[PDB]
Motif scaffolding. Structure first.
Motif, PDB file in Angstrom:
ATOM      1  N   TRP A 116     -30.318 -45.046  67.859  1.00 14.06           N
ATOM      2  CA  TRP A 116     -30.621 -43.627  67.720  1.00 14.06           C
ATOM      3  C   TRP A 116     -30.243 -42.908  69.012  1.00 14.06           C
ATOM      4  O   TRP A 116     -30.845 -43.185  70.061  1.00 14.06           O
ATOM      5  CB  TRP A 116     -32.104 -43.423  67.410  1.00 14.06           C
ATOM      6  N   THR A 151     -30.216 -40.126  71.845  1.00 11.59           N
ATOM      7  CA  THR A 151     -31.124 -39.104  72.345  1.00 11.59           C
ATOM      8  C   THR A 151     -30.336 -37.923  72.886  1.00 11.59           C
ATOM      9  O   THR A 151     -29.120 -37.995  73.088  1.00 11.59           O
ATOM     10  CB  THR A 151     -32.013 -39.693  73.435  1.00 11.59           C
ATOM     11  N   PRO A 152     -31.004 -36.794  73.135  1.00 14.92           N
ATOM     12  CA  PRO A 152     -30.302 -35.680  73.790  1.00 14.92           C
ATOM     13  C   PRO A 152     -29.825 -36.030  75.189  1.00 14.92           C
ATOM     14  O   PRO A 152     -28.698 -35.684  75.567  1.00 14.92           O
ATOM     15  CB  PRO A 152     -31.356 -34.562  73.808  1.00 14.92           C
ATOM     16  N   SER A 154     -36.818 -44.505  61.368  1.00 17.62           N
ATOM     17  CA  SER A 154     -36.321 -43.326  60.671  1.00 17.62           C
ATOM     18  C   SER A 154     -34.805 -43.307  60.752  1.00 17.62           C
ATOM     19  O   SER A 154     -34.239 -43.338  61.850  1.00 17.62           O
ATOM     20  CB  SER A 154     -36.897 -42.039  61.266  1.00 17.62           C
ATOM     21  N   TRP A 175     -33.363 -40.684  59.392  1.00 18.98           N
ATOM     22  CA  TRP A 175     -33.129 -39.252  59.208  1.00 18.98           C
ATOM     23  C   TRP A 175     -32.983 -38.595  60.577  1.00 18.98           C
ATOM     24  O   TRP A 175     -33.915 -38.003  61.126  1.00 18.98           O
ATOM     25  CB  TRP A 175     -34.258 -38.620  58.402  1.00 18.98           C
ATOM     26  N   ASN A 176     -31.778 -38.704  61.130  1.00 17.44           N
ATOM     27  CA  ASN A 176     -31.439 -38.048  62.389  1.00 17.44           C
ATOM     28  C   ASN A 176     -30.891 -36.666  62.052  1.00 17.44           C
ATOM     29  O   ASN A 176     -29.701 -36.508  61.764  1.00 17.44           O
ATOM     30  CB  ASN A 176     -30.434 -38.878  63.180  1.00 17.44           C
ATOM     31  N   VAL A 177     -31.769 -35.660  62.090  1.00 17.01           N
ATOM     32  CA  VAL A 177     -31.392 -34.307  61.685  1.00 17.01           C
ATOM     33  C   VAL A 177     -30.158 -33.841  62.439  1.00 17.01           C
ATOM     34  O   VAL A 177     -29.351 -33.066  61.910  1.00 17.01           O
ATOM     35  CB  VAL A 177     -32.573 -33.335  61.897  1.00 17.01           C
ATOM     36  N   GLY A 178     -29.988 -34.296  63.679  1.00 14.71           N
ATOM     37  CA  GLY A 178     -28.885 -33.849  64.508  1.00 14.71           C
ATOM     38  C   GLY A 178     -27.547 -34.483  64.204  1.00 14.71           C
ATOM     39  O   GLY A 178     -26.525 -33.998  64.698  1.00 14.71           O
ATOM     40  N   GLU A 179     -27.525 -35.555  63.410  1.00 14.80           N
ATOM     41  CA  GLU A 179     -26.282 -36.229  63.054  1.00 14.80           C
ATOM     42  C   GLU A 179     -26.091 -36.345  61.546  1.00 14.80           C
ATOM     43  O   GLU A 179     -25.199 -37.080  61.104  1.00 14.80           O
ATOM     44  CB  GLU A 179     -26.226 -37.618  63.700  1.00 14.80           C
ATOM     45  N   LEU A 180     -26.895 -35.640  60.745  1.00 14.96           N
ATOM     46  CA  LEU A 180     -26.708 -35.670  59.297  1.00 14.96           C
ATOM     47  C   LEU A 180     -25.307 -35.207  58.914  1.00 14.96           C
ATOM     48  O   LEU A 180     -24.700 -35.747  57.981  1.00 14.96           O
ATOM     49  CB  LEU A 180     -27.760 -34.797  58.612  1.00 14.96           C
ATOM     50  N   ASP A 181     -24.779 -34.209  59.625  1.00 12.76           N
ATOM     51  CA  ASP A 181     -23.460 -33.662  59.322  1.00 12.76           C
ATOM     52  C   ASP A 181     -22.325 -34.626  59.648  1.00 12.76           C
ATOM     53  O   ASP A 181     -21.190 -34.382  59.221  1.00 12.76           O
ATOM     54  CB  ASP A 181     -23.249 -32.343  60.076  1.00 12.76           C
ATOM     55  N   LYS A 182     -22.595 -35.702  60.383  1.00 15.46           N
ATOM     56  CA  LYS A 182     -21.586 -36.700  60.710  1.00 15.46           C
ATOM     57  C   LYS A 182     -21.580 -37.873  59.738  1.00 15.46           C
ATOM     58  O   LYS A 182     -20.723 -38.756  59.859  1.00 15.46           O
ATOM     59  CB  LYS A 182     -21.806 -37.228  62.133  1.00 15.46           C
ATOM     60  N   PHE A 210     -36.827 -43.542  55.651  1.00 16.43           N
ATOM     61  CA  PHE A 210     -38.031 -43.597  56.472  1.00 16.43           C
ATOM     62  C   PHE A 210     -38.968 -44.695  55.992  1.00 16.43           C
ATOM     63  O   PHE A 210     -39.395 -44.686  54.833  1.00 16.43           O
ATOM     64  CB  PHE A 210     -38.739 -42.238  56.442  1.00 16.43           C
ATOM     65  N   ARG A 250     -36.018 -40.493  49.403  1.00 14.45           N
ATOM     66  CA  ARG A 250     -35.948 -39.104  48.959  1.00 14.45           C
ATOM     67  C   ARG A 250     -35.349 -38.969  47.567  1.00 14.45           C
ATOM     68  O   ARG A 250     -35.626 -37.978  46.881  1.00 14.45           O
ATOM     69  CB  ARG A 250     -35.123 -38.276  49.948  1.00 14.45           C
ATOM     70  N   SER A 251     -34.535 -39.933  47.141  1.00 11.31           N
ATOM     71  CA  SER A 251     -33.829 -39.855  45.873  1.00 11.31           C
ATOM     72  C   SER A 251     -33.677 -41.263  45.321  1.00 11.31           C
ATOM     73  O   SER A 251     -33.374 -42.194  46.069  1.00 11.31           O
ATOM     74  CB  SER A 251     -32.456 -39.198  46.049  1.00 11.31           C
TER      75      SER A 251
END
Ligand SMILES: C#CCN(Cc1ccc2[nH]c(N)nc(=O)c2c1)c1ccc(C(=O)N[C@@H](CCC(=O)O)C(=O)O)cc1
Ligand SMILES: C#CCN(Cc1ccc2[nH]c(N)nc(=O)c2c1)c1ccc(C(=O)N[C@@H](CCC(=O)O)C(=O)O)cc1
Ligand SMILES: O=C1CCN([C@H]2C[C@H](O)[C@@H](COP(=O)(O)O)O2)C(=O)N1
Ligand SMILES: O=c1ccn([C@H]2C[C@H](O)[C@@H](COP(=O)(O)O)O2)c(=O)[nH]1
Lengths: 263, 263
Positions: free
Chosen positions: A101, A103-104, A131, A133-140, A149, A166-167
């Motif tokens: 994961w 980090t910033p 988790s 679900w890395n909100v910051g890398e979902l687009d990648k 999760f 989720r699905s």
């Protein structure tokens, strides 16, 4: 199994029509929970012949942290072939988030080693979590994390695990997902010298696809067989040193395999 | 409420004697789910008096992306005092992640805005997620997220939401969490011109603290009263333009409050 068949019937009874990301049509419910006490046996569906082959490779593929499907190609696993680019990359999907994961501040967090250490040193922690679900890398990612999760829980020397999905494609994906995480629990329990507890499955959009009615009904008409038992024939010195041939199953005598048009 | 007392009953009858981070001691179960139909009534506990005041100011405080308790002080809301430093800071907690999840490259992500557009433009989406579990910044939070990530769902013009709560103080925290998120559904639904559906509560380590048992036995001896009705006097311009004066609870006649120490 009973909980699985009961879920399918609930979707038939309470499901609403809901067009999906392509327009195929589903019967859908929102919010569902199942419990599998891994002491009673390995939760591998028996009303249709399933196979752990691709489930083992994908789990090991997850644990290595490589999101390139090269390893799957070498081992003849095809579940990810229609999502990768020419390189065979999927983005920072499950494997990447589990082991690295980002980090910033330019660090990386190995959530798998954190959970394992937590289970060994502080099994009473309520923070033992992984988790994807890395909100910051979902687009990648070539696909948003589906089983995104899960959390571990230790009591009476038994290791439990809860997943949030989720699905859920009930007929096609769910038997795969249940078996995958039950495997992970056994692997984690073995490396922590713990017994296995419950696997709790929690779903968001839980649905049957419109073109799975015939396969659903055929499976519903069948009686669950006795659950099989997992046989780990070799204990690795690390959670990341498991091999495909380490896993067998005994007493698995399913009904004829059911096949549908895949994903 | 029926579901709430049933869970409190479930912990007493099946919980395991666990020690916890605070050294208090807890009875603990792992894996539970509850559903609240919001058109039946607003899910605010009635077997003990709960003050909606602090709940509202907290949610409005989350939706502003703020983690300083200074705003909570202005309205005599003190629920987050024992965990903030001198400047009233808690670190990148719920608010910071909801409104500005920090990416690795440096950008920020507004999850509240994201979901609001998904609900309007693609309500069938099965990936309408807000997450507060930022693995990359947990070490900077005064307390890891309890209500760690939730999912939205739309069907038949109704808006539903499911929360995963890794850790639940059944006696003190859960009544606030339920009311808090049910309030968010009413607000999201209002801004999306949708009706309210179900709030699904899923819990990880669900437990009762050892020094709450006497209060629990008292509460269990009471019968839930009819749920009140939430009223929103106005339709703000957006999800972030809500005021404490816009909400008013009608028909909330609870049993007398039961004081208990916080761990
Ligand atoms: C969950 C998950 C992982 N996944 C990922 C995955 C990705 C997209 C999806 N899309 C949809 N609509 N449904 C799915 O369940 C689905 C699953 C899988 C995808 C396919 C198979 C599969 O090939 N099933 C066949 C293969 C039979 C066999 O040879 O064993 C089957 O008939 O069972 C398995 C897992
Ligand atoms: C969840 C959540 C939010 N939170 C945050 C929060 C933070 C740490 C926690 N730690 C523990 N062990 N339990 C809690 O539930 C808890 C809750 C709350 C904290 C306290 C009260 C509280 O003191 N409730 C009293 C009323 C006191 C008052 O505000 O006047 C009560 O009547 O029960 C409410 C919410
Ligand atoms: O919104 C909230 C905040 C946190 N808590 C309670 C649950 C836990 O008992 C406590 C935090 O404990 P930990 O598991 O982090 O060690 O706060 C809660 O119930 N709701
Ligand atoms: O682990 C998985 C991954 C995918 N799916 C199914 C569920 C959905 O029907 C589909 C993905 O579609 P979306 O939810 O992302 O739209 O694949 C599963 O069931 N399990």
């Amino acid at each position: 199994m009973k909980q699985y068949l009961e879920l399918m019937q609930k979707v038939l009874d309470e499901g609403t029509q809901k067009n999906d990301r392509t327009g195929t049509g589903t019967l859908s419910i929102f919010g569902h929970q199942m419990r599998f006490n891994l002491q009673d046996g390995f939760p591998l569906v028996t009303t249709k012949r399933c196979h752990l082959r691709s489930i083992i490779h994908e789990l090991l593929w997850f644990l290595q942290g490589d999101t390139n499907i090269a390893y799957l190609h070498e081992n003849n696993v095809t579940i990810w072939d229609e999502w990768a680019d020419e390189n065979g990359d999927l983005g920072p999907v499950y494997g990447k988030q589990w082991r690295a994961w980002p980090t910033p501040d330019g660090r990386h967090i190995d959530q798998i080693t954190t959970v394992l250490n937590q289970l060994k040193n502080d099994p009473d922690s309520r923070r033992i979590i992984v988790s994807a679900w890395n909100v910051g890398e979902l687009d990648k990612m070539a696909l948003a994390p589906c089983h995104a999760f899960f959390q571990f829980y230790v009591a009476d020397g038994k290791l439990s695990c809860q997943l949030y999905q989720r699905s859920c494609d009930v007929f096609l994906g769910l038997p795969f997902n249940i078996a995958s995480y039950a495997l992970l629990v056994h692997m984690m329990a073995q490396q922590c010298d713990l017994e296995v507890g419950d696997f709790v499955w929690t779903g968001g959009d839980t649905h049957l696809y419109s073109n799975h009615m015939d396969q659903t009904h055929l499976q519903l008409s069948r009686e669950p067989r006795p659950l099989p038992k997992l046989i780990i024939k070799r204990k690795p010195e690390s959670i990341f040193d498991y091999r495909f041939e380490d896993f067998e199953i005994e007493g698995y005598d399913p009904h004829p395999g059911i096949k549908a048009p895949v994903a």
